[PDB]
Design a binder for this molecule. Sequence first.
Ligand SMILES: [Cl-]
Ligand SMILES: [Cl-]
Ligand SMILES: [Cl-]
Ligand SMILES: [Cl-]
Ligand SMILES: [Cl-]
Ligand SMILES: [Cl-]
Ligand SMILES: [Cl-]
Ligand SMILES: [Cl-]
Ligand SMILES: [Cl-]
Ligand SMILES: [Cl-]
Ligand SMILES: [Cl-]
Ligand SMILES: [Cl-]
Ligand SMILES: [Cl-]
Ligand SMILES: [Cl-]
Ligand SMILES: [Cl-]
Ligand SMILES: [Cl-]
Ligand SMILES: [Cl-]
Ligand SMILES: [Cl-]
Ligand SMILES: [Cl-]
Ligand SMILES: [Cl-]
Ligand SMILES: [Cl-]
Ligand SMILES: [Cl-]
Ligand SMILES: [Cl-]
Ligand SMILES: [Cl-]
Ligand SMILES: [Cl-]
Ligand SMILES: [Cl-]
Ligand SMILES: [Cl-]
Ligand SMILES: [Cl-]
Ligand SMILES: [Cl-]
Ligand SMILES: [Cl-]
Ligand SMILES: [Cl-]
Ligand SMILES: [Cl-]
Ligand SMILES: [Cl-]
Ligand SMILES: [Cl-]
Ligand SMILES: [Cl-]
Ligand SMILES: [Cl-]
Ligand SMILES: [Cl-]
Ligand SMILES: [Cl-]
Ligand SMILES: [Cl-]
Ligand SMILES: [Cl-]
Ligand SMILES: [Cl-]
Ligand SMILES: [Cl-]
Ligand SMILES: [Cl-]
Ligand SMILES: [Cl-]
Ligand SMILES: [Cl-]
Ligand SMILES: [Cl-]
Ligand SMILES: [Cl-]
Ligand SMILES: [Cl-]
Ligand SMILES: [Cl-]
Ligand SMILES: [Cl-]
Ligand SMILES: [Cl-]
Ligand SMILES: [Cl-]
Ligand SMILES: [Cl-]
Ligand SMILES: [Cl-]
Lengths: 213, 213, 213, 213, 213, 213
Amino acid sequence: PIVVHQAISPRTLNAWVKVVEEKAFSPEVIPMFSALSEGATPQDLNTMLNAVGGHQAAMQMLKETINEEAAEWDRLHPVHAGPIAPGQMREPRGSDIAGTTSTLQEQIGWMTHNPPAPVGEIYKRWIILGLNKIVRMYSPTSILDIRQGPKEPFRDYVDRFYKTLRAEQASQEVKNWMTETLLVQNANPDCKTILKALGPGATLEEMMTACQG
Amino acid sequence: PIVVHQAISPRTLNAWVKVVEEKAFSPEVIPMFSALSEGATPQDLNTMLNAVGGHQAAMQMLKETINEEAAEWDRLHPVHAGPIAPGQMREPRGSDIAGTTSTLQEQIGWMTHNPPAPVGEIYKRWIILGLNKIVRMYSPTSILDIRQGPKEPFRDYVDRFYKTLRAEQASQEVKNWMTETLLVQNANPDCKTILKALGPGATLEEMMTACQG
Amino acid sequence: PIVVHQAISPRTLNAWVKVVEEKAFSPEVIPMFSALSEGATPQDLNTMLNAVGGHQAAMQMLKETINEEAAEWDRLHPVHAGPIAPGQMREPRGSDIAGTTSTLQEQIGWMTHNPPAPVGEIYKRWIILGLNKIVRMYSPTSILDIRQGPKEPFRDYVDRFYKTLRAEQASQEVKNWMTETLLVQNANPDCKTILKALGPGATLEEMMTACQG
Amino acid sequence: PIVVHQAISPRTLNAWVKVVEEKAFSPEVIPMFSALSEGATPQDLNTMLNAVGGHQAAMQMLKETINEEAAEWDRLHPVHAGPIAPGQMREPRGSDIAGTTSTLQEQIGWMTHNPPAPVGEIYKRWIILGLNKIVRMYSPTSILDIRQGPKEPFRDYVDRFYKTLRAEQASQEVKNWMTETLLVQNANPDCKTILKALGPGATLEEMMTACQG
Amino acid sequence: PIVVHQAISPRTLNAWVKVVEEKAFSPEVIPMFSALSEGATPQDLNTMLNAVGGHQAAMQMLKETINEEAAEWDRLHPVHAGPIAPGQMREPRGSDIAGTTSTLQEQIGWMTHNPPAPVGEIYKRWIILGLNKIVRMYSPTSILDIRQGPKEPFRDYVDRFYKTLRAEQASQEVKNWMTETLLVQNANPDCKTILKALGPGATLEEMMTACQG
Amino acid sequence: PIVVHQAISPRTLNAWVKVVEEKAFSPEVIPMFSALSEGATPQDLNTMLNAVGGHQAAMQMLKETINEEAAEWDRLHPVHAGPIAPGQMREPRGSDIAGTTSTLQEQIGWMTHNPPAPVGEIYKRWIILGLNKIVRMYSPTSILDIRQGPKEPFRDYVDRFYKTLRAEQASQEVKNWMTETLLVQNANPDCKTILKALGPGATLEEMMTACQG
Ligand SMILES: [Cl-]
Ligand SMILES: [Cl-]
Ligand SMILES: [Cl-]
Ligand SMILES: [Cl-]
Ligand SMILES: [Cl-]
Ligand SMILES: [Cl-]
Ligand SMILES: [Cl-]
Ligand SMILES: [Cl-]
Ligand SMILES: [Cl-]
Ligand SMILES: [Cl-]
Ligand SMILES: [Cl-]
Ligand SMILES: [Cl-]
Ligand SMILES: [Cl-]
Ligand SMILES: [Cl-]
Ligand SMILES: [Cl-]
Ligand SMILES: [Cl-]
Ligand SMILES: [Cl-]
Ligand SMILES: [Cl-]
Ligand SMILES: [Cl-]
Ligand SMILES: [Cl-]
Ligand SMILES: [Cl-]
Ligand SMILES: [Cl-]
Ligand SMILES: [Cl-]
Ligand SMILES: [Cl-]
Ligand SMILES: [Cl-]
Ligand SMILES: [Cl-]
Ligand SMILES: [Cl-]
Ligand SMILES: [Cl-]
Ligand SMILES: [Cl-]
Ligand SMILES: [Cl-]
Ligand SMILES: [Cl-]
Ligand SMILES: [Cl-]
Ligand SMILES: [Cl-]
Ligand SMILES: [Cl-]
Ligand SMILES: [Cl-]
Ligand SMILES: [Cl-]
Ligand SMILES: [Cl-]
Ligand SMILES: [Cl-]
Ligand SMILES: [Cl-]
Ligand SMILES: [Cl-]
Ligand SMILES: [Cl-]
Ligand SMILES: [Cl-]
Ligand SMILES: [Cl-]
Ligand SMILES: [Cl-]
Ligand SMILES: [Cl-]
Ligand SMILES: [Cl-]
Ligand SMILES: [Cl-]
Ligand SMILES: [Cl-]
Ligand SMILES: [Cl-]
Ligand SMILES: [Cl-]
Ligand SMILES: [Cl-]
Ligand SMILES: [Cl-]
Ligand SMILES: [Cl-]
Ligand SMILES: [Cl-]
């Protein structure tokens, strides 16, 4: 990464590979990825993705997404040809941002320029976009099917609900609505009755303490 | 964290994730969290919370608490609109402090300003507030139910008492009173008799050495 | 490596040796190698290759490849004899680049000169060239033999396809064609029918969600 | 710690928690604590104590001891009220030293002042005082009960003797006397006879080599 | 090591001790040794050798070799007596290079002088010379006895051949000849026939792909 | 240690404690100790010794030895009383060197003075002196009892011989003589005959290759 440049740390790299081995594509993999790639160059970012053995269906989807974002980038930032002046960098293309048509030193040039052409953070955006698609698609459950069982402690139901929620394809307002409707609606008869009695203004803290017994 | 800024360390992060895997929400998780987040930016803080897979009931309660503290913040610090001058930062909102409507560079701007707008320490406060609620709620036992058994070594009873005490929803003065009343009151007849004989001025050292035999 | 020079880290080195123990010569070994050798001197690079115990058939092929690239280098950069002036370095030969006829201090001299004679990155190129040959040759499967099974979840077939693809001796355009033809062509009758119905413009995301059920 | 200030390291912290898990309160825990807390702020010190889950009987005794030392401190250093001048720090109270009524920045202010108000080393003193009480109290054996067995190799007896000795509540002169009297006195008849014959000027080296056979 | 001087790292040291525990004296131990001792002082080097428990037959041979190289050094660099001037170092003897009659500060003096008396790299040379003798002597197999078995995959034969080759006492030209003669000559009848048909100009890549089936 | 001062590293410390757990007092423990204590203050040194749980017979012998060396030090360096001038340090006593009557800052004062009063290296000397006594005394075997068995590979006999040799109480010249006499003298009849035939000028390399078959 950049803090000029240093090599991606072996411990960071192995951390990233361990995460993908164990967790597959659970939601928490994405903040984990962001943390391990803070200040990363496109090179470092490619290193991280390429280091993954297996899950090549997902890694291929991630390439396709990256190439979409690259094409969009080109479309919005059309190249202006000419001799690049002394003390200046060329305008990065879609592929320069994703690291396949740029050198490390060009990447360092962009990231440390005044003002910066922040290509790592652009590429990280695109990567995370692709990671989000995969997480969603690889989620086994649907939020509409999370139903508290007759003798299931409320806390375990809430744990399943919000896990499934975190992997859903939905904006914040749509998630807010799933909480407004489904959580209470899909509780078991006893808890459901008690939570209806608390009203629709009640906090999760309130609801959980209410169905403790 | 800030010491300007560096990436949250992979070892720090994995430390934090390991703690939540093993300890769940035992009281000691909170000082552990403070230690691993010393100098953290809101981004780093979010990284740490988001890295947690599972316990999404608790992580959701923690969001709700954070949003309460954010609303309170807004209420007390009402926004003053206008063009921000050169060499100045905008006044942070509730959501800017919690990292969802601020960039990392805005966070770095606030934390390193003269005088600092110490947004990490504010957000850490709010997080720990939420962590304290969860610990309490997830405590299995009540302090009123800790009773020394007939053949239970006094030290093991004191160990259960003060563990349960540490997870209670009570100020220092209320805790002081639980010690004043319950510890001696809920000892077994033999130890109880011996500790009554020491009087109410006796130290824990004194009490433990007294019921050693 | 160079960041002047420091010793290759013991953790980096053991990382590299662990990778070759576990993964043998799976495709992901090569980005792993690049990451662990960022800024490496030819010495450091030789250290990494020499540290490998076993796989001496492959390590011998890698030597042969290195010596080919060295001979090519000599051919294109013919030596110009004469006394090297003060404040100057000799032109590196093929073997100087590969570290067998150069000292560490000569390597440091080249890598830190203005402009640099970037001998580490040249030698890394040649090494990776040799690593790519070995990966291909040591691949057990051929892309033409990857056929989805009658009850095989489409995702597992796509996982086998793109794993085998990544180890193939083929340019990007030839890979693009294997995707254009073989993926859909070698699916099982049910999925094959559904993917034919999507047409040849369909994304992998689209194709996978289509054959989910 | 301070070396200005950096966060307590995650490895240091986990080291400390591991020590208390494994060793409980064996004597060697205290030098271990001193090592892991070199240059610590009161905050760092509290972090270390608070990180301990379990042993809350002992952790409570340690609080009581800390509060005693704090009260003594107040008694000897009575507060002098007034506006603190520019370029000056307030006189630390007992609780400021123990970190509960001081900020980290006040602690850093004291520890880095010219001359320093060395609050970490004061609090560490008090902590170690409390740790010493606990070790003693939690020692299972008494030095008066360590008796060499009939077929016990002298070296194993000396190992038990000096282990039990290290956990005793006794000054150096009292320990010197336990060595003068008990070691030889409580040896088995054969070794006891041989060590009486060496006289009271003999070194431990001499005594051990004497009872080797 | 020197990068002035720092202590040999505990991780480096334990790395070195682990290598000798596991690998004994396989060829790869020597590049491993060079890597872990980059910039080492004679002291550091002695530390590494002395840290080895066991294999004292080999460690004794290594001493004998070191003392030979030391005697040779003395012979070629005969001592010139006299008062050493201010701003000057004495000429190092054989034993000064090997660290037994020099202080660390004398070693640092030599290694950092302008021009350097590079005593670490001299002693490392001598050590590696001794390590090479041991590897050879401790090799179980002879290159003349490596014969492909009737149903042995060619790749496994080539793996045994080049492993045994790497431990041989032979210059490059002699190794080149063992490849020219023995590899093909000692293949099984089927592979042997196919490799004879490729001719004596064929690469290892070519030969291995030829005997794949 | 000093490189001014930093805290002994947790990894160094745990390294040292692990060594004493596993190896007990095998000869290699002493170079291990020197490595882990390079640049150590007396405080750091005491930390390392005090961190050892168990082996208190040996740790007590080590104290006795330290106190002997301290008394000798006092004897040779008799204290000269008077007011210590500005810009000066008091002359260290035996106990100041061993860290029990000196502060860390006094130790840092001595070690960094121009010229240095190198108290760490003095105390390390004394410690290693004591460690050497213990190793010798705790050695199970005597060099006079190492006899090659009738079917024992010569290399294993040489391994036992030089291990036992390394733990002996003997100068270099006395060790040289044990090699001159005992090694060949205590070989089995077959090897003994062959080594007599090589003569008394033969190297260990020569002797081992001679008794290979
Ligand atoms: Cl690392
Ligand atoms: Cl994987
Ligand atoms: Cl998955
Ligand atoms: Cl790749
Ligand atoms: Cl796969
Ligand atoms: Cl450019
Ligand atoms: Cl942008
Ligand atoms: Cl479900
Ligand atoms: Cl409802
Ligand atoms: Cl790290
Ligand atoms: Cl978890
Ligand atoms: Cl829980
Ligand atoms: Cl997230
Ligand atoms: Cl869960
Ligand atoms: Cl702003
Ligand atoms: Cl505030
Ligand atoms: Cl209970
Ligand atoms: Cl009562
Ligand atoms: Cl390292
Ligand atoms: Cl291997
Ligand atoms: Cl393989
Ligand atoms: Cl090699
Ligand atoms: Cl092999
Ligand atoms: Cl040159
Ligand atoms: Cl080039
Ligand atoms: Cl297949
Ligand atoms: Cl088709
Ligand atoms: Cl760390
Ligand atoms: Cl514990
Ligand atoms: Cl205990
Ligand atoms: Cl706490
Ligand atoms: Cl407990
Ligand atoms: Cl103040
Ligand atoms: Cl004080
Ligand atoms: Cl006992
Ligand atoms: Cl007696
Ligand atoms: Cl380390
Ligand atoms: Cl070993
Ligand atoms: Cl061996
Ligand atoms: Cl040694
Ligand atoms: Cl051995
Ligand atoms: Cl000199
Ligand atoms: Cl030389
Ligand atoms: Cl063989
Ligand atoms: Cl032939
Ligand atoms: Cl560390
Ligand atoms: Cl131990
Ligand atoms: Cl032992
Ligand atoms: Cl101690
Ligand atoms: Cl013991
Ligand atoms: Cl002084
Ligand atoms: Cl001295
Ligand atoms: Cl024996
Ligand atoms: Cl003889």
